[PDB]
Amino acid sequence: MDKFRVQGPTRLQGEVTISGAKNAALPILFAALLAEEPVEIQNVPKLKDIDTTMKLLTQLGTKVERXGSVWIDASNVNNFSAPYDLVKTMRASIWALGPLVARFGQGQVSLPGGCAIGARPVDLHIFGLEKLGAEIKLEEGYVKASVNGRLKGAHIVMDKVSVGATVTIMSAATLAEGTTIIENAAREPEIVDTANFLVALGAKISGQGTDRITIEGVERLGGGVYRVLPDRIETGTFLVAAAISGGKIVCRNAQPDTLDAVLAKLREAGADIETGEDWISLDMHGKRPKAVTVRTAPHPAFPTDMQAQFTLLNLVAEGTGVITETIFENRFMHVPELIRMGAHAEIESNTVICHGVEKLSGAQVMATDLRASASLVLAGCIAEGTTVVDRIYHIDRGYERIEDKLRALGANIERVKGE
Ligand SMILES: CC(=O)N[C@H]1[C@@H](OP(=O)(O)OP(=O)(O)OC[C@H]2O[C@@H](n3ccc(=O)[nH]c3=O)[C@H](O)[C@@H]2O)O[C@H](CO)[C@@H](O)[C@@H]1O[C@H](C)C(=O)O
């Protein structure tokens, strides 16, 4: 049971090279199930979720190898199930369903149960598949999808903006007969990425990145080489790390355009930001951040994955900051943890009201969220004394070598085993 032992405070200074987006590599790996020829996916981060996805793929009969790239050979898929033991550790596993039934006519994925973050049903995925002509049943806790022949293109309107369902439907539609239109599609950069990967394979897609995606199904998808875009959440997290430590940093291998809301918020916090084609620089000039007000919502608005990070910022900022969550209404586990470290805040429904304090004190805290829990490690870097973060296996799922990157910035951090 690994733990991080963090000794603060530290001014974070230096450079970080941004990893490929975990959230683009995932949907792309599942989408690779459609490829009839070998595929090379470049710039894939090394983290737990990629391990789980590789494991799931191998379990289907996919040939998998990795380093910076992940090589996929789905020529011999011979198993069509994603078991409970696997799905329970990573709900994103649901993405295996669409490609399976679209290409093979059959797929069975354990129905995801509860997730600590909040209510996260996959009704939209199933709805999308059915509209495509798939027959779906629930047996023994398994979602069983089937179709005799090809799926069928359809005009679908989304009851909610959904990253997951948009990917399920979009992916499955590339092999359908006819044209599919997804109305009220999610606009996330990862969706544009996945679509581009599909297009590189031979798929016909347009509108990716807009609220309206159109797919013209083809008979088969080939193979190819595709480079995954930079991780916007990793980038935001590092920018925040610098901004709350009076620091200075340059992010390499970045994609500024995927970060508008976060950059504008950092500027409001008082950060001096410059951007280039593939880089972002942030300098606090040793200043304490200014509290900001944030509202999470579908891309390009402020993302829920940067939420806890900004809550932290608000917590050591000057002034009252307010954070409202409209995606995962209960994604506030980090708050009582930070309050253990001396922070001040009240949760009213889906909103956290922050009362910035001058300094945090080191304490024992518990990670629970693969993205938001990074805020606990960030807090440890600027808190007075020693902070011990328990359950880092969560963070291991969403960040490539977070200790290494922080350490290269001056952080005093140690991975503790057992003890
Ligand atoms: C693997 C991956 O990319 N996961 C990401 C993706 O989750 P996803 O699951 O697709 O999110 P949604 O469908 O956009 O979530 C949409 C909202 O709508 C509801 N909804 C979603 C689908 C559905 O069928 N029915 C339905 O009701 C849902 O409850 C949520 O409130 O998008 C989230 C928001 O950006 C991210 O926080 C999440 O990252 C996480 C941390 C991670 O890296 O593990």
Question: Cβ distance 150 to 181 under 8 Å?
Answer: no
326: part of which helix (H) or strand (E)? none
Tell me the C-alpha distance between 404 and 413, whole Å: 9
**Cα torsion through 206, 209, 211, 217, rounded to 10:** 30
Residue identified by tokens 């880092």 is 392
Closest ligand 1 atom to residue 125 Cα is 24
Where does the chain hold its CATH 3.65.10.10 domain(s)? 1-18+230-418, 21-228
Nearest CA to ligand 1 atom 33: 163
Question: Cβ distance 206 to 228 under 8 Å?
Answer: no
Query: Cα of 50 to ligand 1 centre, how many Å?
Result: 17
Hey, CA dihedral for 265, 405, 354, 23, is it positive or negative? positive
Query: What residues form DSSP beta bridges with 16?
Result: 251
Query: Cα of 260 to ligand 1 centre, how many Å?
Result: 20
Query: Cα of 333 to ligand 1 centre, how many Å?
Result: 17
Tell me the C-alpha distance between 218 and 224, whole Å: 16
Residue 162 marked in a binding site: yes
Which residue type, as a one-letter code, is found at position 352?
V
Tell me the C-alpha distance between 23 and 228, whole Å: 10
Ligand 1 pocket mutation, candidates 89, 325, 327, 330, criterion most atoms within 8 A of CB: 327
Angle between helices 374-382 and 307-315 (to 10 degrees): 20
**How far are the Cα atoms of 63, 217, 272, 306, 388 from residue 315, in angstroms, in the given order?**
47, 49, 20, 14, 19
Residues 6 or more apart whose CB falls under 8 angstroms from that of 359 comprise 9, 316, 342, 383, 384
The residue among 173, 171, 224 whose CA lies nearest residue 201 is 224
Question: Cβ distance 239 to 251 under 8 Å?
Answer: yes
Q: Which CATH number fits domain 1-18+230-418: 3.40.600.10, 3.65.10.10, 3.40.30.10, 3.30.1200.10?
A: 3.65.10.10
Question: Cβ distance 340 to 364 under 8 Å?
Answer: yes
238: part of which helix (H) or strand (E)? helix 232-243
Nearest CA to ligand 1 atom 41: 371
Tell me the C-alpha distance between 416 and 393, whole Å: 12
Which residue type, as a one-letter code, is found at position 282?
L
The CATH number given to 21-228 is: 3.65.10.10
Ligand 1 pocket mutation, candidates 163, 168, 309, 371, criterion most atoms within 8 A of CB: 163
91: part of which helix (H) or strand (E)? none
Question: Cβ distance 311 to 334 under 8 Å?
Answer: yes
Query: Which bin fits 181, alpha (ψ -120 to 50), beta or left (φ > 0)?
Result: beta
Closest ligand 1 atom to residue 372 Cα is 41
Closest ligand 1 atom to residue 164 Cα is 10
Ligand 1, CB within 6 Å, residue ranges: 23, 26, 92, 119-125, 160, 162-165, 186, 303-305, 327-328, 370-371, 398
List the determination method: X-ray
Residues 6 or more apart whose CB falls under 8 angstroms from that of 107 comprise 80, 96, 97, 98, 99, 100, 101, 144, 145, 146
Nearest CA to ligand 1 atom 6: 163
Residue 105, phi then psi, degrees to nearest 5: 80, -5
Question: Cβ distance 381 to 411 under 8 Å?
Answer: yes
100: part of which helix (H) or strand (E)? helix 97-104
Half-sphere exposure of 337 (CA within 13 A, CB side): 28
- Resolution attained, angstroms: 2.2
Pairing of the two strands 385-390 and 39-42: unpaired
Residue 229, phi then psi, degrees to nearest 5: -65, 165
Tell me the C-alpha distance between 96 and 375, whole Å: 30
Tell me the C-alpha distance between 82 and 88, whole Å: 10
Q: SS3 string of 133-177?
A: CCEEEEECCEEEEECCCCCECCEEECCCCCHHHHHHHHHHHCCCE
Q: SS3 string of 173-215?
A: HCCCECEEEEECCCCCHHHHHHHHHHHHHCCEEECCCCCEEEE
Nearest CA to ligand 1 atom 16: 162
Tell me which residues are annotated as active site.
Answer: 115
83: part of which helix (H) or strand (E)? none
Closest ligand 1 atom to residue 117 Cα is 41
